[PDB]
PDB file of C-alpha atoms (C1' of nucleotides) and ligand atoms in Angstrom:
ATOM      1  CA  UNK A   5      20.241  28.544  -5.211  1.00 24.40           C
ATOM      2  CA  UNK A   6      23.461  27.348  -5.267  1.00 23.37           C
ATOM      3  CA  UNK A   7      25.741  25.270  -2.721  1.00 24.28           C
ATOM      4  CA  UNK A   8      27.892  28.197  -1.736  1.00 22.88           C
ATOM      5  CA  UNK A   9      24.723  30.583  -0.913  1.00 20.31           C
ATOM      6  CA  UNK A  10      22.884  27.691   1.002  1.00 20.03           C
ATOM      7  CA  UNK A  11      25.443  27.089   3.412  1.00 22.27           C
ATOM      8  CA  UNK A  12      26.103  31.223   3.355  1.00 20.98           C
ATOM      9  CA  UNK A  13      22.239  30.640   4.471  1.00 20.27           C
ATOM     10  CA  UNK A  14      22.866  28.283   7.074  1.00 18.73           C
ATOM     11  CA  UNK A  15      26.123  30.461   8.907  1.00 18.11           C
ATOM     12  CA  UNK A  16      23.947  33.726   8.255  1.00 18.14           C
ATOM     13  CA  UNK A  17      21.415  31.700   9.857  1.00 18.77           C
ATOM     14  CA  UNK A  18      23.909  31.031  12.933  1.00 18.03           C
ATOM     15  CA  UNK A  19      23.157  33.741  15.686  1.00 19.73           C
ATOM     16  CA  UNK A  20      26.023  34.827  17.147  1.00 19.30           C
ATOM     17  CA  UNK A  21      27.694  36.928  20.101  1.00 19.00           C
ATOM     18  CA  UNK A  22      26.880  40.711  20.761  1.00 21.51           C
ATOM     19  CA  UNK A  23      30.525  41.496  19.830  1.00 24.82           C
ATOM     20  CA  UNK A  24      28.671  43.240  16.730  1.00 21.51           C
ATOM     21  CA  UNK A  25      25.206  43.945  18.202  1.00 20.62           C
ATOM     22  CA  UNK A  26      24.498  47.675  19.093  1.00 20.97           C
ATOM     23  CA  UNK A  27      21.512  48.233  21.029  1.00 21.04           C
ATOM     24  CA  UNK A  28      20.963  52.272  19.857  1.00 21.56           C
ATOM     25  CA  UNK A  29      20.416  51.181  16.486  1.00 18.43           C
ATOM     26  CA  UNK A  30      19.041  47.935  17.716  1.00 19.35           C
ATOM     27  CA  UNK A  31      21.489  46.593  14.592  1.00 20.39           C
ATOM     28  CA  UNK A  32      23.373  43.748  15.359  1.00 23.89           C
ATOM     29  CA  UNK A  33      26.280  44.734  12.442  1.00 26.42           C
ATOM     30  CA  UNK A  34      28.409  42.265  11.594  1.00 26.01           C
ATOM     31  CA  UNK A  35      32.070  40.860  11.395  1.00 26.42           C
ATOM     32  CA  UNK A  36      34.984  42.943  13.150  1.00 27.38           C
ATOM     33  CA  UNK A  37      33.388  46.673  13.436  1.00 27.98           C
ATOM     34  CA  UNK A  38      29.912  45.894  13.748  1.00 28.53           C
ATOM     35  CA  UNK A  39      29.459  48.687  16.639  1.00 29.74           C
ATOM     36  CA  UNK A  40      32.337  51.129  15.678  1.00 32.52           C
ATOM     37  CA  UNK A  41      30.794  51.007  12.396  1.00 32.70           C
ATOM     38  CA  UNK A  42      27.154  51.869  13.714  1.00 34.84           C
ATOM     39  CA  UNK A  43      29.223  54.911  15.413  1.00 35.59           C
ATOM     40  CA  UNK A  44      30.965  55.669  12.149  1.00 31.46           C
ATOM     41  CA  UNK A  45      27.204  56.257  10.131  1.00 29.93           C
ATOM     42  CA  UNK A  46      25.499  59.067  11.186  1.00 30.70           C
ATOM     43  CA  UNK A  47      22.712  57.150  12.444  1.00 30.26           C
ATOM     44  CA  UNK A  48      24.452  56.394  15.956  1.00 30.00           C
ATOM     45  CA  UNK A  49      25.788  59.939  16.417  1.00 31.10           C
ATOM     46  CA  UNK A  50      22.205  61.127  16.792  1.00 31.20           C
ATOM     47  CA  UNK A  51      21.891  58.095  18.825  1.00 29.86           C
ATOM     48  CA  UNK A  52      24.444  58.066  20.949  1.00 30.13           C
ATOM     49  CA  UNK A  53      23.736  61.742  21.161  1.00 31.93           C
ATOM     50  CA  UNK A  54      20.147  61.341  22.742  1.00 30.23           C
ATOM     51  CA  UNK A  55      21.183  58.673  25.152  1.00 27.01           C
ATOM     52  CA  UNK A  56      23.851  61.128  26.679  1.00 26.88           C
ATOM     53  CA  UNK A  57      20.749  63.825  26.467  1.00 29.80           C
ATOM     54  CA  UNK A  58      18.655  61.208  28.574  1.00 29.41           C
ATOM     55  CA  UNK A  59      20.938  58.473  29.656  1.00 30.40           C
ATOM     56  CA  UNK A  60      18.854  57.546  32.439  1.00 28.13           C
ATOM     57  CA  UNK A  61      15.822  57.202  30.942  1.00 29.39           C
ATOM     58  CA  UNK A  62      17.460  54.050  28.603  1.00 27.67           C
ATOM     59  CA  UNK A  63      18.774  52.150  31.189  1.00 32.37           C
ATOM     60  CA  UNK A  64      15.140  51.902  33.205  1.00 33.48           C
ATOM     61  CA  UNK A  65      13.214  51.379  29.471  1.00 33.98           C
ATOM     62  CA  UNK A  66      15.686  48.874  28.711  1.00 33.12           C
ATOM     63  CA  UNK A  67      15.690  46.954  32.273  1.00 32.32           C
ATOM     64  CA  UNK A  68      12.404  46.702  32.076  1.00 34.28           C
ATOM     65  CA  UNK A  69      11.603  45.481  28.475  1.00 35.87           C
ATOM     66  CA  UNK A  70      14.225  42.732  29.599  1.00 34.34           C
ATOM     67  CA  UNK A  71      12.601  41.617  32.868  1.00 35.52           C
ATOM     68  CA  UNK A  72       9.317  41.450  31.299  1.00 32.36           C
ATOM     69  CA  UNK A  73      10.752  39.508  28.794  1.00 31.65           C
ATOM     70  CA  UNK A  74      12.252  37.653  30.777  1.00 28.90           C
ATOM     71  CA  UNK A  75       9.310  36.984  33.308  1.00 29.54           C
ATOM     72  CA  UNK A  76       7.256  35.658  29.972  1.00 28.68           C
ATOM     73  CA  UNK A  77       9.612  33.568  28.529  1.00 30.37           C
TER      74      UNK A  77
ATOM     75  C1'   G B   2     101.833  55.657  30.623  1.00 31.86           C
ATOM     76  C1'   U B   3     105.804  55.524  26.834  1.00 30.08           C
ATOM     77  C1'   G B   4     110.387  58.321  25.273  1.00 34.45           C
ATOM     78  C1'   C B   5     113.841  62.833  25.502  1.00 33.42           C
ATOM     79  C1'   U B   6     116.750  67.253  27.500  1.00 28.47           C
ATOM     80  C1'   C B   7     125.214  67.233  26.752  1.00 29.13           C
ATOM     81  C1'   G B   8     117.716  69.148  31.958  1.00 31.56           C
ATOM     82  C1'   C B   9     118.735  70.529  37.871  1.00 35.32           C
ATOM     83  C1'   U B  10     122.129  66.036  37.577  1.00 32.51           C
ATOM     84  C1'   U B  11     122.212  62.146  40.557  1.00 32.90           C
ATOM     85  C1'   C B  12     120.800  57.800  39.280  1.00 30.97           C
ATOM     86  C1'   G B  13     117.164  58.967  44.789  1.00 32.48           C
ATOM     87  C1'   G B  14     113.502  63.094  44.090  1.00 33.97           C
ATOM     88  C1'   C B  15     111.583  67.782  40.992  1.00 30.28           C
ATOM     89  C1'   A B  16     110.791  70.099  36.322  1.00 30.02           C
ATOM     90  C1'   G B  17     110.458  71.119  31.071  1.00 29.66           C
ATOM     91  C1'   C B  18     109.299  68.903  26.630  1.00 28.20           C
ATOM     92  C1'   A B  19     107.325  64.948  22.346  1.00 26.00           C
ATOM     93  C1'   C B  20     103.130  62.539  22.582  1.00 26.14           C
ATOM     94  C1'   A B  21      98.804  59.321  24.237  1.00 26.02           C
ATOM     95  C1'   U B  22      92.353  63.276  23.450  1.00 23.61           C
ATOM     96  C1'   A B  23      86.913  62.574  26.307  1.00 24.06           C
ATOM     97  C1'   U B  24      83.367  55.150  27.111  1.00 27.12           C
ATOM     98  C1'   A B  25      78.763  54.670  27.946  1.00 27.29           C
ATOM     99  C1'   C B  26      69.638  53.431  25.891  1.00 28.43           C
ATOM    100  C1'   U B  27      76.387  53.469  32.024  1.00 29.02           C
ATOM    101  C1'   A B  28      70.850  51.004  35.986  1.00 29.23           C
ATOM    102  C1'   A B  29      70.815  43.751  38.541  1.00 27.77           C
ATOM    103  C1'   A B  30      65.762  48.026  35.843  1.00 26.48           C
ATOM    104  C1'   A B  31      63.424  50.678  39.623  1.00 27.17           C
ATOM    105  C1'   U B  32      58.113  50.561  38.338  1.00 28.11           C
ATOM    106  C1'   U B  33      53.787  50.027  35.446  1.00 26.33           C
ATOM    107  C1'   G B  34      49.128  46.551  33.960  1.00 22.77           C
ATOM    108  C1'   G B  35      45.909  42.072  29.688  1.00 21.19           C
ATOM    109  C1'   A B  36      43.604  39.097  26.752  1.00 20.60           C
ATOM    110  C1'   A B  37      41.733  31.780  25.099  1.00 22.01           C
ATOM    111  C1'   C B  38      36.514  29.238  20.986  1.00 22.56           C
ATOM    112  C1'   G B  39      40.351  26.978  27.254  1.00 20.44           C
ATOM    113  C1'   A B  40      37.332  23.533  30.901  1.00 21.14           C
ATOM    114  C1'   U B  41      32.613  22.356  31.909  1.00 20.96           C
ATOM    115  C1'   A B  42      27.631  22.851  31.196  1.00 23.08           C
ATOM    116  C1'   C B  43      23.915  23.626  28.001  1.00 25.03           C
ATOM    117  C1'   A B  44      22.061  23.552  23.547  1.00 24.91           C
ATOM    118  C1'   G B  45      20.967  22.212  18.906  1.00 29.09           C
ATOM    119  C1'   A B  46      20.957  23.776  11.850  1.00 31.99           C
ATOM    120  C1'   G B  47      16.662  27.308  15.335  1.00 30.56           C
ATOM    121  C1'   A B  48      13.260  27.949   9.517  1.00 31.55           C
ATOM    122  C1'   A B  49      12.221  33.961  10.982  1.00 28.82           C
ATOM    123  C1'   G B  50      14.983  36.177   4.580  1.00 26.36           C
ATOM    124  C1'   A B  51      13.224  36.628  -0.833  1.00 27.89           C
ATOM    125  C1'   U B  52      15.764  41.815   2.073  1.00 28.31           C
ATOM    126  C1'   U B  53      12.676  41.824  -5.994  1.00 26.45           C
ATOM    127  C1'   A B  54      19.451  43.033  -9.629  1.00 25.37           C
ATOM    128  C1'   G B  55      24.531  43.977 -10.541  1.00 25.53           C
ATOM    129  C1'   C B  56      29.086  47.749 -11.448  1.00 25.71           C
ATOM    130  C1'   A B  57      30.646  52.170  -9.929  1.00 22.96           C
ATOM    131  C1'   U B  58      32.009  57.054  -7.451  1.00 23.57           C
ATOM    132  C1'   G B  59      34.713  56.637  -2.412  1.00 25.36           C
ATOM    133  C1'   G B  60      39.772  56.958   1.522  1.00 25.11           C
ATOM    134  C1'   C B  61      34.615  52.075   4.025  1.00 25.30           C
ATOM    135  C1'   C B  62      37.822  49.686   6.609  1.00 28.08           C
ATOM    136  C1'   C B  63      40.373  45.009   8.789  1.00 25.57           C
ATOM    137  C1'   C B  64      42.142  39.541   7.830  1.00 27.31           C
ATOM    138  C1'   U B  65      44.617  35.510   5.380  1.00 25.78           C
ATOM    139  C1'   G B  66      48.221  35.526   1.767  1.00 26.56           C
ATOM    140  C1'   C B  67      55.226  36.723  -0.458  1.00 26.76           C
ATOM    141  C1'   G B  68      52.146  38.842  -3.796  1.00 28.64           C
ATOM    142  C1'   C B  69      51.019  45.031  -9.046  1.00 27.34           C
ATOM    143  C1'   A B  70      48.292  36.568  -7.204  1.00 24.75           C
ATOM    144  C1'   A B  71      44.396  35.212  -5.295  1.00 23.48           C
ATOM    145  C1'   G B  72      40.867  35.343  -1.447  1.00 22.59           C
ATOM    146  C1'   G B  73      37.711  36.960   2.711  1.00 20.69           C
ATOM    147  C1'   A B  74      34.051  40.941   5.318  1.00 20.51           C
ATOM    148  C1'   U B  75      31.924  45.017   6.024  1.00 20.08           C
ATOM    149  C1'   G B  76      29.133  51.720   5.670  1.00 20.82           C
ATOM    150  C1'   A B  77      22.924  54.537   2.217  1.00 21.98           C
ATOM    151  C1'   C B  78      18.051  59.889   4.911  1.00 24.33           C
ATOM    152  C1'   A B  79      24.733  60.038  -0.230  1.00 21.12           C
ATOM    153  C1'   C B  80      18.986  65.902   0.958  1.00 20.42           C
ATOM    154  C1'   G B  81      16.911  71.984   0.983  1.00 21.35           C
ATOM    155  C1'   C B  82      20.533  74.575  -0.482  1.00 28.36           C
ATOM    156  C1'   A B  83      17.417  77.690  -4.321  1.00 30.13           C
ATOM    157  C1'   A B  84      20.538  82.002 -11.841  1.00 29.80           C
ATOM    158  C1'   A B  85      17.704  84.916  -9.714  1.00 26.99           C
ATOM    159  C1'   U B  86      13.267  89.463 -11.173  1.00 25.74           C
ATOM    160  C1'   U B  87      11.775  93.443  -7.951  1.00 26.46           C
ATOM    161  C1'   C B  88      12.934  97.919  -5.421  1.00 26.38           C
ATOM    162  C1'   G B  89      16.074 100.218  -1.995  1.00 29.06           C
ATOM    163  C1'   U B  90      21.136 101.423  -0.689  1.00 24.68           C
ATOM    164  C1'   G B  91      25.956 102.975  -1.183  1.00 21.52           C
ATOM    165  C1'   A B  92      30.543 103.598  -4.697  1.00 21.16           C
ATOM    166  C1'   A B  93      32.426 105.302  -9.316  1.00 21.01           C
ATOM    167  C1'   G B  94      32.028 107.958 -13.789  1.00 19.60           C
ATOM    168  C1'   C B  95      29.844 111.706 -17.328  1.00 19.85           C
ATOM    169  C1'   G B  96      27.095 116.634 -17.719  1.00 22.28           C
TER     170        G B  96
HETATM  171 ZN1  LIG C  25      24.702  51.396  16.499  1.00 23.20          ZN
END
RNA sequence: GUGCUCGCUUCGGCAGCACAUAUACUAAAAUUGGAACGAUACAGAGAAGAUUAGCAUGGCCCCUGCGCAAGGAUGACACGCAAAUUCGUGAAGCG
């Protein structure tokens, strides 16, 4: 609409670095908490919770979405 | 260390007295361990967004800013909790 929310547009359009992005919620939060902030809603405490109840069952999934990805692309 | 005893009593020594009252993370530190929007290289506004309202509660926090300026940027599955009888139980009291 206006000037200020287009160009809020184009920087929200700007992808940026993981610094905020947590994988558990899949949320890539935003703008100096981002992940502690995930931890801080209840959301990643049950989370967090079931990857230390199966941690290594989430690091195979994951690897594996990622190579196939990876092998498509 | 200063000064004094008609001090021993010479001027050499000893004593007695008057004071003068307690520095200081004392270490040459012993040790201990980190990050850049830096260089390059790439790459290219990547539409995916109409996410159809705002203000609150609230301590949800950090940054700029000298600010009781001003200004940034963020958290929503915010719920089921149950007034309400029914008997049973025990306790008390009265006869
Ligand atoms: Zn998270």
């Amino acid at each position: 609409l206006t000037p200020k929310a287009i160009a809020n547009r184009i920087k929200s359009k700007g992808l940026q670095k993981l610094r905020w992005y947590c994988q558990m919620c899949q949320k890539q939060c935003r703008d100096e908490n981002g992940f502690k902030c995930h931890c801080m809603s209840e959301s990643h405490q049950r989370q967090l919770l079931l990857a230390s109840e199966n941690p290594q069952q989430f690091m195979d999934y994951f690897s594996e979405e990622f190579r196939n990805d990876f092998l498509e692309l």
